[PDB]
Amino acid sequence: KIIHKIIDLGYAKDVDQGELCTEFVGTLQYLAPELFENKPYTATVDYWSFGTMVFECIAGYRPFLHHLQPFTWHEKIKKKDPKCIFACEEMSGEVRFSSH
Amino acid sequence: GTMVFECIAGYRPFLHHLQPFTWHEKIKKKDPKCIFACEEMSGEVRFSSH
Numbered sequence: 001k002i003i004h005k006i007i008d009l010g011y012a013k014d015v016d017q018g019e020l021c022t023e024f025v026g027t028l029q030y031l032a033p034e035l036f037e038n039k040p041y042t043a044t045v046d047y048w049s050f051g052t053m054v055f056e057c058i059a060g061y062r063p064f065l066h067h068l069q070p071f072t073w074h075e076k077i078k079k080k081d082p083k084c085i086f087a088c089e090e091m092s093g094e095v096r097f098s099s100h
Numbered sequence: 101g102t103m104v105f106e107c108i109a110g111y112r113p114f115l116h117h118l119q120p121f122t123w124h125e126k127i128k129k130k131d132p133k134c135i136f137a138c139e140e141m142s143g144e145v146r147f148s149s150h
Binding site (some may be wrong): 024026027028029069070071072073 | 141142
């Protein structure tokens with residue numbers, strides 16, 4: 001059977017000798033909106049990364065605006081309705097939200 | 101000035117291809133004596149006077 005395994009922690013944070021490792025990363029797309037403000041983050045930051053992928057592993061794309069740079073891919077869902085787990089763009093460029 | 105910069109980098113002194121219509125509202129602030137401002141891989145925007 002296929003065995004999934006996490007890898008590379010040259011970015012992950014800890015508590016012992018060596019708080020954090022690096023601030024920014026590369027072509028972000030799957031990360032909690034915490035590090036996007038450099039403000040006091042939490043330990044739940046991982047839950048988001050995992051969740052987002054789980055969604056994609058069912059739909060085949062991001063839980064919000066796919067192929068849309070996280071720059072604006074944020075402000076558009078900044079509020080992101082409660083319990084919402086999806087938000088694509090209608091054929092007319094419109095934006096639709098949904099918790100289904 | 102703008103050209104001199106490009107003659108060293110190979111592109112605009114700020115945002116490349118980014119039409120001037122929205123190009124200004126993005127560099128209107130421009131740090132004290134800034135001469136560069138591209139867009140990160142994540143579409144983000146970064147400024148620099150180097």
